[PDB]
Amino acid sequence: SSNARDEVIAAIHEEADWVDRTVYPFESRCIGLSSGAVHYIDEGPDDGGRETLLMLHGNPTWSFLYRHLVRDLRDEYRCVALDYLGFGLSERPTDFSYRPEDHADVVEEFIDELGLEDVVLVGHDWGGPIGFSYAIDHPENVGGLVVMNTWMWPVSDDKHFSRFSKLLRIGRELCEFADRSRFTESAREQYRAANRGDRTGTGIFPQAILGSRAWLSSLWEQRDNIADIPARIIWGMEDSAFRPAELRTFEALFEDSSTVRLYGVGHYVPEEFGSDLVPLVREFLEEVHHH
Amino acid sequence: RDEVIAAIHEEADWVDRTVYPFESRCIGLSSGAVHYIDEGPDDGGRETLLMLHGNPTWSFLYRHLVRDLRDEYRCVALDYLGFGLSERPTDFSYRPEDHADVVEEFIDELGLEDVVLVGHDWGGPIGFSYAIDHPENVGGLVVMNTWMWPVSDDKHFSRFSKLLRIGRELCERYDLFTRVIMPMGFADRSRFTESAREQYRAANRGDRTGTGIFPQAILGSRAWLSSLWEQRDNIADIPARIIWGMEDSAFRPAELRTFEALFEDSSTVRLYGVGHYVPEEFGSDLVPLVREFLEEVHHH
Amino acid sequence: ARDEVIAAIHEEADWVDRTVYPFESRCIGLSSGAVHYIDEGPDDGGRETLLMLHGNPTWSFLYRHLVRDLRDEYRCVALDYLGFGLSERPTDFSYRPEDHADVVEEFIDELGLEDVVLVGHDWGGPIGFSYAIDHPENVGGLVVMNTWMWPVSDDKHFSRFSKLLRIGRELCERSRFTESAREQYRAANRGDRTGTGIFPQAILGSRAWLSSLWEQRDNIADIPARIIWGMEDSAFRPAELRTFEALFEDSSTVRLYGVGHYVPEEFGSDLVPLVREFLEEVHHHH
Amino acid sequence: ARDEVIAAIHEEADWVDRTVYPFESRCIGLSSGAVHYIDEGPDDGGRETLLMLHGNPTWSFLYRHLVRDLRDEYRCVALDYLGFGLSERPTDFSYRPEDHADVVEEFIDELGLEDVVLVGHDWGGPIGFSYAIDHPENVGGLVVMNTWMWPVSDDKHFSRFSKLLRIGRELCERYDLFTRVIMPMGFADRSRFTESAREQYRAANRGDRTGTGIFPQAILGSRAWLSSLWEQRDNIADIPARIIWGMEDSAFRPAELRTFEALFEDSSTVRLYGVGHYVPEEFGSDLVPLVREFLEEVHH
């Protein structure tokens, strides 16, 4: 497995000069987990800081999505962000399913290797369900939830998500008005560049929206594990994928929670709202710090 | 008021009583007089039920429940002002936030206790707007295709409310609500029986102002809906049975999931092949699902 | 007679912009003098009764947007203080806030309003808060905009403002009104201007009365209130806002960035949904 | 161990005028760094226990007048934050106010202080309230002097001062304009900021004074923490409080004082006309009866 770490770090020299370290200044680090070698950010004060944050991306994004948080919270907080296998700088193993139920096991295996504790989970798109796994069955070790444009329920009866899955594709390209397109051409290329190579994970996810109903049920049916974890929900209101209908569902679920509604903001909240997200997260981290 | 109560009685029965066998009773309330069902055992019923209709429906919507559950239960069902045979007063607002005041005023004059509320469509919010401030007089909730939150940011609800806001004056002219909106609320177009279809269309004539104000109020009453949602935890622990027409395009499963999160004492019936008007389309087959709830409630 | 004298002058006061101020003008002969007031709503008295109290040097034209857009379901009442608007300007009244407070109680009693929601801006704070201090059982809730309820004679900010030399408060202290609106105020501030000049003095001249409200503020601390703050206001800073946020157990704060002192004017029709969100909350305590 | 090196700086800190600071120098090796502190009183625990928390660029010498005289009957504890007085100046610490409050919690628990009365001045307010707000049953009362507990990023008053000192930090640190310039304008009578004390504060704040310079930045930069306090203000409001305020302070106005008078359910205010920001200096031993008066009333 230590050989698998070499494979990633070799790729960092052979195939990662394109990463714009001016906006992604963070040190690259790698762990050879059993399913394969992940790439991760871990940056913060050497104390380990006021809190440890774990940031989980979606499809077809990667940890570059969180660079605004990591840059501005690594002052007082330990920021950790993980490239899923198949994505970012992580290994692209032939062996793996890329099914959400299996990515969730990689996240748990990642947490329990690094020994992260009382973590705050930041979750976007599939990073919701994937992170809610560890919150469903390790709620003692989760400090709080940062929720953005995602869900925690089976959706196979709603024609909306059904249509999105059943449509023909190789993978989810980023784009399914305040401006005609929502990303800087700089960032849009940094995402496209990471989606070079084996992109299989980008197409398994939209299929698994229906194909993992059992796993989504396995979260939804024991959601009561999570309902008293403190949470803040930060929602791109102009998202076509996750409507305010999904938002109302979380506003019922949580006892101790607060909601930020971002009008004019679409799906990729940590891009489109940028560094204005930081004070909303930081407000929550200090609210969490009273334990 | 007294001549109006008599006027409500004496020309009532264009109704097919052979399917609506109930004794019609009338209350003089401050806003005007209302017509209601009150049917059950002569002793204090095993449980007490109050059934609140959607638009443009009326107590006749619940006839299948009353017909069977009056074996054991006090079935109450009420026509709001403007609907069924209730008064159509010149001065009332027909606002849903005011209907909830009238249902409070009604409930206090009947003095119901540990009430189980059956909420369809607008009857949901109208019921919840009593249960959320008298929760310790409410015994349980039967939820069918409804909601309890402001939908003003969802394009899905927006388009329909805007469209019917625009077309209101025309829809009132020719009753497009019963002639079109009700027909589309079924998964089997034949199940909206020719008798029922004609009965609704006969009922909702004269002044029908209430039929057209409701689809505006989806957006127009956001402040009241907001107040309910902000108070939601006053209701989160009452027992609820949720029965949902899975073919309804108005209230998706995405609304259903919100009730499933709101109520911890709840369970859900997914009526695949049933549309919005579950008490019509599922008919007498609905009755056992209400009994299964009322047993678990009464056995505590 | 005294109310008939207002009937005379208001028939001469055809300058009022009845396009935006269509409301039926009504008048009461109170003991201190004749007041002019709005009373608009359904014949039912509606879901709530609102009393709306203006500031200096404004008048009930300030609240026209609330009245116009709430009168379909709620009873909106708005009062011109003596000395202001179309109300009488008697030689014998003090125009001191501690006496306006008594007139507001008298007005409420003679109209017979019950479980009122009070809407207050500038001096319409303390003057309204006086009633809510000593009849808190008759108050359904409070709408709080850019005002205060405490003695400030040690605060250099309010001290300078009162100790500055003037005839009366001018509206503006590159502009935040329409000239339609400005003239609608400036016309009413023609004639006997006296009350406009006592208000800025009484900020210090009535410190004792302001103490009396402050020292019994617990009479009010659990009345529900919604606070709606013009954040660019120089007169009533966030420093005042924090003091209300501490006082009220049951309250919410709405912060209007880019809005100045005259929140009802500068926020206009967009204020109405903030009040409805409050009225439909208060209605469940009732 | 590093704490023994803190004793080594004591073995070189003869400059501390013990004729006015007649207290035993004590040290705790906390995890973030070693802190110097005072602990004085009756030979077994006094009638009540005091913990005294200072502002910028002050230190426990600010409280010398209280420790000198209240140790007759009370346990006086007084602390130097990391970065200040004779406490350690670690190279890795943040010197953030919200981290000082974590060190103060860690200090309180290591000493096992119980039913504490907290004295807070300037930043010592927030730093103290960030314990009393989540351990209210371990706190008996609050002494409040010229301080606050809320974000002020919308107040151009506090914004102007913080932004100015954010810009000027690089020079204000190098030349110590905090003690030399900022402290004097915190007095209503410069003759009451004695030439002795002015040296004492300036001697205590030579060396690495990073923490003195970050403090005025944090007025804005700590907004998230200040919010997390202010949103929980009701956790403190029932604790009894004595407020003693320098009315000639331009930094914390009586408009801040009104906020505390609104917040507390049980409070008394002392209005020191003719006294500035540094009340414990400028009001000296005359302050002490106002603290004793409070502790005698706290003692039920």
Residue numbers in the entry:
A (entry chain H): 5 to 180, 194 to 308
B (entry chain G): 9 to 308
C (entry chain J): 8 to 180, 197 to 309
D (entry chain I): 8 to 307
Task: Please give me the paper's original passages concerning this structure.
Haloalkane dehalogenases (EC 3.8.1.5, HLDs) are a group of enzymes that catalyze the hydrolytic cleavage of a carbon–halogen bond in a range of halogenated organic compounds. Here we probe the structural organization of DhmeA, a subfamily III HLD‐like enzyme from the archaeon Haloferax mediterranei, by combining cryo‐electron microscopy (cryo‐EM) and x‐ray crystallography. A distinct catalytic pentad forms the active site of HLD enzymes: a nucleophile aspartic acid, a histidine base, a catalytic acid (aspartic or glutamic acid) and two halide stabilizing residues (two tryptophans or tryptophan + asparagine) (Janssen, 2004). We show that full‐length wild‐type DhmeA forms diverse quaternary structures, ranging from small oligomers to large supramolecular ring‐like assemblies of various sizes and symmetries.
We noted that the solvent‐exposed L10 loop, connecting α4 and α5' helices in the cap domain, displays a unique feature containing two glycine residues (G173, G174) in DhmeA. We thus constructed a DhmeA mutant lacking these two glycines, hereafter referred to as DhmeA∆GG. Importantly, the DhmeA∆GG protein could be reproducibly crystallized. The final model contains 10 DhmeA molecules in the asymmetric unit and has a low deviation from the ideal geometry. The 3.3 Å crystal structure reveals that DhmeAΔGG forms a ring‐like 20‐mer structure with outer and inner diameter of ~200 and ~80 Å, respectively. The crystallographic ring contains three types of assembly interfaces, namely di‐, tetra‐, and multimerization interface. An unusual striking feature of the DhmeAΔGG organization is that the first monomeric unit in the homodimer has a complete, properly folded helical cap domain, while the cap domain of the second monomeric unit is partially unfolded and distorted. Notably, the electron density map between residues R181 and D196, encompassing α5′ and α5 helices, is missing, and this part could not be built into the model. Therefore, we suggest that the cap domain of DhmeA protein may naturally unfold, which leads to an uncovering of the active site. The exterior of the ring together with the multimerization interface has a highly negatively charged surface, while the interior is decorated with a positive charge with the highest positive surface charge density around the tetramerization interface.
